[PDB]
Design an enzyme around this catalytic site. Sequence first.
Site, PDB file in Angstrom:
ATOM      1  N   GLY A  33       4.979   3.890 -13.070  1.00  0.00           N
ATOM      2  CA  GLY A  33       5.991   3.031 -12.573  1.00  0.00           C
ATOM      3  C   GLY A  33       6.830   2.930 -14.306  1.00  0.00           C
ATOM      4  N   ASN A  41      -1.377  -3.225 -12.474  1.00  0.00           N
ATOM      5  CA  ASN A  41      -1.992  -2.738 -11.141  1.00  0.00           C
ATOM      6  C   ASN A  41      -2.436  -3.127 -10.349  1.00  0.00           C
ATOM      7  OD1 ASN A  41      -0.415   0.611 -10.450  1.00  0.00           O
ATOM      8  ND2 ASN A  41       0.616  -1.206 -10.662  1.00  0.00           N
ATOM      9  N   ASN A 100      -3.506   5.218  -6.415  1.00  0.00           N
ATOM     10  CA  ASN A 100      -2.117   4.946  -6.166  1.00  0.00           C
ATOM     11  C   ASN A 100      -0.685   5.527  -6.529  1.00  0.00           C
ATOM     12  OD1 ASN A 100       0.450   3.659  -6.009  1.00  0.00           O
ATOM     13  ND2 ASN A 100      -0.089   1.931  -7.268  1.00  0.00           N
ATOM     14  N   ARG A 172       7.769  -8.214 -16.176  1.00  0.00           N
ATOM     15  CA  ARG A 172       7.605  -6.717 -16.687  1.00  0.00           C
ATOM     16  C   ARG A 172       8.805  -5.480 -17.402  1.00  0.00           C
ATOM     17  NH1 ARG A 172       3.019  -6.627 -16.236  1.00  0.00           N
ATOM     18  NH2 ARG A 172       2.989  -4.152 -16.885  1.00  0.00           N
ATOM     19  N   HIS A 250       5.836  -0.516  -1.170  1.00  0.00           N
ATOM     20  CA  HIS A 250       4.445   0.607  -1.739  1.00  0.00           C
ATOM     21  C   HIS A 250       3.606  -0.305  -2.302  1.00  0.00           C
ATOM     22  CE1 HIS A 250       3.747   4.387  -3.386  1.00  0.00           C
ATOM     23  NE2 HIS A 250       3.960   3.834  -4.793  1.00  0.00           N
ATOM     24  N   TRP A 251       3.297  -1.037  -2.819  1.00  0.00           N
ATOM     25  CA  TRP A 251       2.221  -2.236  -3.394  1.00  0.00           C
ATOM     26  C   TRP A 251       1.552  -2.488  -2.588  1.00  0.00           C
ATOM     27  CZ3 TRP A 251       5.174  -5.265  -7.380  1.00  0.00           C
ATOM     28  CH2 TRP A 251       5.813  -6.336  -6.698  1.00  0.00           C
TER      29      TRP A 251
END
Lengths: 272, 272
Positions: A33, A41, A100, A172, A250-251
């Site tokens: 990303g 992460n 990941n 971010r 997702h995470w």
Amino acid sequence: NLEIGKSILAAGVLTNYHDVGEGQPVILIHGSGPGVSAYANWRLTIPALSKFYRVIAPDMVGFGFTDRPENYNYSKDSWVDHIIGIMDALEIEKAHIVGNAFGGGLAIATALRYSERVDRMVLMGAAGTRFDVTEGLNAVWGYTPSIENMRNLLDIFAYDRSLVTDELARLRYEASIQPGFQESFSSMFPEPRQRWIDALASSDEDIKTLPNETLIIHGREDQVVPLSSSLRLGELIDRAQLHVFGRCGHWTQIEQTDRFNRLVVEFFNEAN
Amino acid sequence: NLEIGKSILAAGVLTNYHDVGEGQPVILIHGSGPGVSAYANWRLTIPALSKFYRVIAPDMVGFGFTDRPENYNYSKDSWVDHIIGIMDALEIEKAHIVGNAFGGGLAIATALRYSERVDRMVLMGAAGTRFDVTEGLNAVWGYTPSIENMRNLLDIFAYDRSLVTDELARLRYEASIQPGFQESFSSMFPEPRQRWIDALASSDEDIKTLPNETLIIHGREDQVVPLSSSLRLGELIDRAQLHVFGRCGHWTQIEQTDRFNRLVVEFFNEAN
């Protein structure tokens, strides 16, 4: 900036990486990303794992604070070469690997080309074979800087949006605009993006040859990589276990932290 | 005979059951194979769980060493009533429930009718909704006594057949021919057997209302209950986790004992 760790020359690339703990080595490979880094992460994963293993978390070339070589030829094989270069640089002969998504595809590719260098694998929200690009993934790879775009992107990764604060979005967003970041990112997976899913994937035939004990993890509500991709990985890999978290995007390492950390540590502990 | 434990009157039925450990109560419900009993199914599970919980494992009416009342009306609701009757008899107000296949269907039905009596659930190799009868299941329910039939049946449950010895086959064959056992068993799920899958199942609509934290476990190579059934349960139950073991048949508690026991104990431990 806690995202900056130590520096090491790996495969000819000045690489940023984190190294915490002692014992059996575990390599954590982040996703793809915007503004991503090994620390971003795995910050909630390293602490737990480092109590039982030596944890290595590097920024893949083209991402994070690792150097972005002029005219570098980015590809599945180049990234695999970087991973191996990192292991070589650190005298890590064989290691467990946690990947990941993007990093999971790389983990599989590394295990196929360098079987002797990989022990156990944990594939999180990843895909081994090709799948039709999702709206979520195209949004992620098609990201352009803005706090609203980052907030929306973070929302795509999460099941519980209450975890996505304006503060996190701002942080971010700022990460995504660091010098040269968006430049390399935007040029990394250009349209049509299905090409990159296809290039990063491994054939069904190759995946079936993997002898590694594998733990496939996925969030039921994953909007980026479809659950079906992990189900498929689970049908192809012989010594595999599949763990799907309901109410999880997702995470999973972020939304189901403790459950994730326990599964992973215990999975590696089996190797004694 | 270690399969014989203590006796208690539950829902008007003299019930055989095992009670080991102290603390939070956990009810283990066995499957529906010939000669099945709570002990036969959970002998390798009780020891581990009993170190942290009070484990109750009863023989469902019509199975094991529990009484087989003349003209008893066997049904999903009657079995649910037996389970509740057992809990009432033991002053167990609320408990976690682990159900193996047949027992998993009963766990779901109990949670739907007596939501207040069930906390967390573990559904192993079970189905919540209907699925087309498999060759494996019809063979199991259509069993007639013989060591070869039992050996073949045990092979249907296992991934690694080397675990199925002639000795084990003989022991379970002998279990299946105890006085009145085959009589009640053969009359329990008569042809056409699809009817019983349909009767034991719960509607998609009802399953979606379950508020319970649930852990769905299944063996990839399960020849009795298809993996697809657990995948479906995982799509319907909100607070669910799915764990599929590769290289594992129907009886995951037997072929993946340590992994199973750790997942279950830790899953219940979360409830603090």
